[PDB]
Amino acid sequence: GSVVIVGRIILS
Amino acid sequence: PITAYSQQTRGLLGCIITSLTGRDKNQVDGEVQVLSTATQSFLATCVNGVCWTVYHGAGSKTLAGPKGPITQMYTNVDQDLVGWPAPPGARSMTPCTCGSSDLYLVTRHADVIPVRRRGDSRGSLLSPRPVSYLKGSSGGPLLCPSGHVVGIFRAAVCTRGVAKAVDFIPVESM
Ligand SMILES: [Zn+2]
Incomplete structure (x- = not known):
């Protein structure tokens, strides 16, 4: 069972 | 002086499918990734070409990537840290x-x-x-x-x- 990216957070 | 927004990329169905197929063909981007499993969800942080996260969420699992599942390059249970080679697209801090x-x-x-x-x-x-x-x-x-x-x-x-x-x-x- 693989861990999945379900979203990202963009910084500035 | 520091600000951030989020962007979702999957829902439950896609998430479950991707776990079994170990193959995330979505675009990767951002400094921090929102990761999920079946039971729980948490964050990863890309530093120097490596997605770092916590063992108490990720365990020893692979990360579903474009070419296929990605093995952990680093795994420490005591200090609760794991790392995968970051997939292409991630912005390494x-x-x-x-x-x-x-x-x-x-x-x-x-x-x-x-x-x-x-x-x-x-x-x-x-x-x-x-x-x-x-x-x-x-x-x-x-x-x-x-x-x-x-x-x-x-x-x-x-x-x-x-x-x-x-x-x-x-x-x-x-
Ligand atoms: Zn500093």
């Missing part, structure tokens, strides 16, 4: 190199909250928060004023559902 005690914790909900550095792996919150506000933000970065990675969020210290300080994995280890 950089360590602190300045020693500021004025930290910023980026949450699951793209919120940036003030943190005071107190120990080598500890920092207190300036405004106490509900524990639920912090849950699922494991692996989220603690930033210095100029937005470099001081550490990665590991655990919180609570009293009756309200968190007043945070424990984090210091960046040196990575």
